[PDB]
């Protein structure tokens, strides 16, 4: 599961459970894009320990798509997949 702990119309706070397949993971890539897009996707990355992320500058009233990718130091694994995804609206 991926959760939004809090929202404001601009801004998001989001959480995920730790895996499971860590160590596995060097970092989490995070992508948020407008939910089906004109928008270019935005991705940023955080350390494997981090359970929490902030997304900012969002438009009000817009449905959104948020994707988390967990990134594996070469030949872990734990395979592979999934990216885990959610949609939220201003």
């Amino acid at each position: 599961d991926l959760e939004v702990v809090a929202a404001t119309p601009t801004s998001l706070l989001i959480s995920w459970p730790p895996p499971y397949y860590v160590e596995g993971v060097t970092v989490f890539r995070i992508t948020y894009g407008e939910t089906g897009g004109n928008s270019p996707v935005q991705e940023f990355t955080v350390p494997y320990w981090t359970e929490t992320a902030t997304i900012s500058g969002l438009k009000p009233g817009v449905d959104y798509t948020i994707t988390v990718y967990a990134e594996m130091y070469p030949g872990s694994p734990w395979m592979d997949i999934q990216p885990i995804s959610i949609n939220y609206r201003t």
């Binding site: 160590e23 060097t26 955080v46 350390p47 494997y48 320990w49 981090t50 902030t54 130091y73 070469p74």
Partner: protein, 273 residues
């Protein structure tokens, strides 16, 4: 060189090769430049921190087109910043590599997770700097980073001016040593495990590891380096590492000052610091 030492070096070598992209082939999508209060006098200090850095940037095409960027002279402006967004992306890309490199090592994975976090946060800039050095060209005064290159401006100024900044001096001095890849990799290991670093419960375990690596570095040089010249060399490298830790502290202060008037930092950088 004990079978264990040889094994230790082998593991480090593997991690770097997986860990580290010398090409910077996979470095993509970076930002590019051009693309009354008081606080201020914070600004005058901030300008000083920026001033030391400043570099030309060159991009090489798949075409073999070259793009050259020359940074503005200071002004007020907020000109000074312009590189900063690009720099953060490069640091962020480097950091991801650094984190993997730690992850690969068996000893690091073994460590209690809180300890990993403390070490990585302490380590990360120093390791990143060490990786940069391998790219660095003293004669050029350039870091060559695949298609990307960064070239130092000449203040003229001088070398005498240039050497004033600790980071620049360190790269030139480290480059002089002409280290083997094993030597560079060991340094990262010694840096990566520091007992000192803030937030570390498990001092005793780390210190042994750091010592064990240090001996391996000491052993390697004596066996592999033909001795008579090189008797010093281990001492100098250790000296460089000590210098690095101090430089790391200086950098950390600088970033905080820059951010506070200006924020560039990526989420990973904030997470890491």
């Amino acid at each position: 060189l004990t079978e264990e030492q040889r094994m230790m070096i082998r593991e480090l070598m593997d991690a770097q090769m997986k860990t580290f992209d010398t090409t910077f082939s996979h470095f993509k999508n970076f930002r590019l430049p051009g693309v009354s209060r008081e606080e201020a006098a914070k600004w005058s200090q901030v300008r000083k921190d920026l001033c030391s850095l400043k570099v030309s940037l060159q991009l090489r095409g798949e075409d073999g087109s070259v793009w050259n960027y020359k940074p503005p002279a200071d002004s007020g402006g907020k000109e000074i910043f312009s590189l900063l967004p690009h720099m953060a992306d490069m640091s962020t890309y480097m950091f991801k590599g650094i984190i993997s490199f730690a992850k690969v090592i068996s000893y690091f994975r073994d460590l209690p997770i809180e300890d990993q976090i403390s070490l990585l946060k302490g380590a990360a800039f120093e390791l990143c700097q060490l990786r940069f050095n391998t790219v660095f060209n003293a004669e050029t005064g350039t870091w060559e980073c695949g298609r990307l290159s960064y070239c130092l401006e000449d203040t003229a100024g001088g070398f005498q001016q240039l050497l004033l900044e600790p980071m620049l001096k360190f790269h030139y001095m480290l480059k002089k040593l002409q280290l083997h890849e094993e030597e560079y990799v060991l340094m990262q290991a010694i840096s990566l495990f520091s007992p000192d670093r803030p937030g570390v419960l498990q001092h005793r375990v780390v210190d042994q590891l750091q010592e064990q690596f240090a001996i391996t570095l000491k052993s390697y040089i004596e066996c592999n380096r033909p001795q008579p010249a090189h008797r010093f060399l281990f001492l100098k490298i250790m000296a460089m590492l000590t210098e690095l830790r101090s430089i790391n502290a200086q950098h950390t202060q600088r970033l905080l000052r820059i951010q506070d008037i200006h924020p560039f930092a990526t989420p990973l950088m904030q997470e890491l610091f």
